[PDB]
């Protein structure tokens, strides 16, 4: 459980790090789709930079992004088990 919680912290700061994905996701999504595939049919350097840091969390991105709710559930269950052992 302690290690799963640390992995939860990883995937949580990854939820600040996928925030970069979402930010450039919203960005690319709106700009390229709306503009240059409706009305006709800076953006490369730091784009490839992040896109290689994007390779980087997808290598970290063996997804266990279930971590938040699973951590909550199993923490509560551990508490119940500890109390039952003390009464025993």
């Amino acid at each position: 459980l302690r290690e799963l919680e640390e992995e939860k912290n990883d995937l949580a700061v990854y939820h600040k790090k996928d925030n970069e994905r979402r930010c450039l996701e919203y960005a690319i999504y709106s700009r390229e789709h709306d503009e240059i595939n409706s009305v006709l049919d800076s953006s490369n350097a730091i784009v490839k930079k992040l896109h290689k840091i994007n390779e980087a969390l997808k290598d970290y991105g063996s997804v266990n992004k279930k971590a938040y709710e699973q951590f909550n559930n199993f923490t509560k269950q551990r508490d119940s088990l500890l109390a039952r052992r003390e009464e025993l």
Partner: protein, 559 residues
């Protein structure tokens, strides 16, 4: 208003009224500083104000009207109602206020699905905050009422608090129905779908806890709550296959925490007069979707020709032979899903390993199969066939090899007897015929079929238009029509497929010249649903299935 030759006046009128409410409430929250009126309430801290649920419900009625006409592409909300949601969240970030906030979320969820255009004025974050609201008020708010009913003064307490739970469950039923609306209509992200499929187990764990702690059994409201979740689960199953497995990965897990007695397992009755356990309808419902094809047309250059018994003029037979590519995505995935489930639970529940199967996990499964029997005959389900035949193709595997324990060979046999005693007396002994507009309806019950089966073609015309109107506005039985047809057209090809028919399978091309006319789509009925079950392997291979008992009377062993 009310126009009999048009509605445009009604449309623009109600749109005007709505935009009027918009401007009104906006200029109110702007110019209201200490005025107390019928739209807002000044809080105990008189610095605070918030809408009356009356005005909330008024907005809900307005959108309810605008829905049936659908002016979503016709309204300004951008910096017009976005501010409304801003006020909402402003309050939300932190009993009467609880119910009120339930009304607010009900209404804004009604607001969200109005507009299906590109922007739709939601950045997929506020909705997640609403989901957080629901989950937080769901997971440690009904246990307070649990404690207040089971650990109260225990004096008239069985009739003093449950009604609060009932009205709460009605409210969460409303929000669950609007959640199903938004789940089917708009496309979603993935964090939200993980969130909702993780919402569901909390429902199942707490209602099991209630059913165990207090045997009062007045839990029909829990069924009201349980009913609409599986609709969302089916929609997400059919639409987002990239995590189609994952939901399955837990849908059976919660199957372990079920009522372990008959008087509690029996639940919502069926139409033909049988009572089942409602949780069982989840399994069939997933394969009820099973990504049935919906691009029936737009694969061939042309519809039918005039003389198919000489040459497929115009249309391409190979283009007609593209259906099995799709049907492979149906067929070779149905069993693939069916074997993640059947093999798992039968593996544990058959063997008597460690105090769960022999204790209870072999009891939950044994009533599930019975449910699957009673719900088989009915037309609103059509996956019950392909699910039960997989049970057969596992039991027959077990009793062949001697690599299993002595009681293993006992217990699997009992589950055979449940199937055969019901399927043999199901139709074979009752009718085995028809008389109104039948086929010759007498043949060998083997791969041999009816040369003059063209009569069956028009027999499958009713229950196609009949199944078109019965769920026109609703989507909760949408996939029933294509499955009950797309799993008969393939059999008509499979009949054309088999072997050795020089012009004898060209009358079936003339029957293709009759059924493929329905590529132009739809321009008593109970028994017709039955007759198609006599092309499945379950009904067909019954003699090869009773082989494992009659030719197994004598044995090496005695048990």
């Amino acid at each position: 208003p009310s126009k009999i030759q048009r509605l445009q006046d009604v449309l623009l009128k109600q749109l005007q009224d709505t935009r009027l409410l918009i401007s009104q409430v906006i200029e109110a929250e702007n110019s209201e500083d200490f005025s107390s009126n019928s739209l807002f309430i000044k809080r105990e801290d008189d610095d605070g104000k918030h809408i009356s649920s009356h005005a909330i419900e008024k907005l809900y009625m307005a959108l309810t009207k605008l829905s049936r006409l659908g002016a979503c592409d016709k309204l300004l909300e951008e910096g017009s109602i976005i501010l409304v949601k801003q006020i909402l969240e402003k309050e939300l970030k932190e009993f009467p206020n609880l119910d009120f906030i339930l009304k607010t979320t009900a209404l804004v969820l009604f607001i969200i699905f109005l507009v299906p255009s590109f922007k739709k004025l939601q950045n997929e974050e506020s909705i997640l905050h609403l989901l957080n609201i629901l989950h937080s008020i769901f997971e440690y708010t009904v246990p307070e009422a649990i404690d207040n009913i089971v650990q109260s003064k225990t004096s008239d307490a069985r009739t003093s608090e449950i009604q609060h739970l009932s009205v709460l469950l009605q409210k969460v039923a409303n929000v669950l129905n609007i959640l199903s609306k938004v789940a089917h209509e708009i496309p979603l992200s993935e964090a939200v779908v993980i969130r909702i499929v993780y919402l569901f187990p909390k429902v199942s764990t707490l209602d099991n806890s209630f059913k165990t702690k207090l045997p009062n059994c007045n839990s029909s409201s829990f069924d009201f709550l349980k009913a609409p979740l599986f609709q969302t689960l089916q929609y997400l199953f059919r639409l987002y296959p990239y995590q189609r497995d994952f939901i399955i990965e837990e849908s059976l897990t919660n199957f372990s925490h079920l009522p372990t007695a008959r008087s509690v397992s029996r639940t919502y009755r069926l139409s033909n007069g049988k009572s089942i356990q409602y949780y069982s309808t989840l399994f069939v419902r997933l394969i009820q979707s099973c990504s049935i094809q919906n691009l029936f047309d737009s694969e061939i250059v042309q519809s039918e020709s005039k003389s198919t018994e000489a040459l497929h003029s115009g249309n391409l037979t190979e283009h007609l032979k593209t259906v099995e590519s799709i049907l492979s995505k149906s067929r070779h995935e149905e069993y693939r899903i069916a074997n993640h489930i059947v093999a798992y639970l039968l593996s544990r529940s058959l063997k008597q390993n460690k105090t769960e199967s022999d204790n209870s996990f072999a009891i939950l499964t044994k009533i599930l199969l019975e449910d699957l029997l009673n719900m088989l005959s009915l037309p609103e389900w059509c996956g019950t066939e392909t699910i039960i035949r997989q049970f057969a193709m596992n039991l027959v595997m077990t009793v062949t090899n001697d690599k299993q324990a002595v009681s293993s060979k006992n217990a699997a046999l009992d589950l055979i007897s449940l199937i055969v005693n019901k399927v043999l007396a199901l139709f074979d002994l009752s009718l085995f015929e028809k008389h109104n507009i039948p086929a010759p309806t007498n043949f060998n019950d083997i791969i041999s079929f009816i040369p003059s089966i063209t009569r069956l073609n028009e027999l499958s015309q009713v229950s196609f238009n009949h199944f078109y109107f019965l769920c026109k506005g609703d989507i909760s039985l949408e996939n029933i029509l294509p499955y009950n047809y797309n799993k008969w057209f393939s059999f008509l090809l499979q009949l054309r497929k088999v072997c050795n028919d020089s012009e004898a399978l060209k009358i079936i091309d003339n029957c293709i010249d009759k059924n493929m006319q329905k590529s132009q789509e739809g321009f008593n009925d109970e028994d017709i649903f039955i007759i198609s079950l006599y092309h499945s392997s379950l009904f067909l291979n019954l003699k090869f299935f009773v082989s494992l008992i009659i030719g197994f009377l004598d044995s090496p062993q005695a048990s």
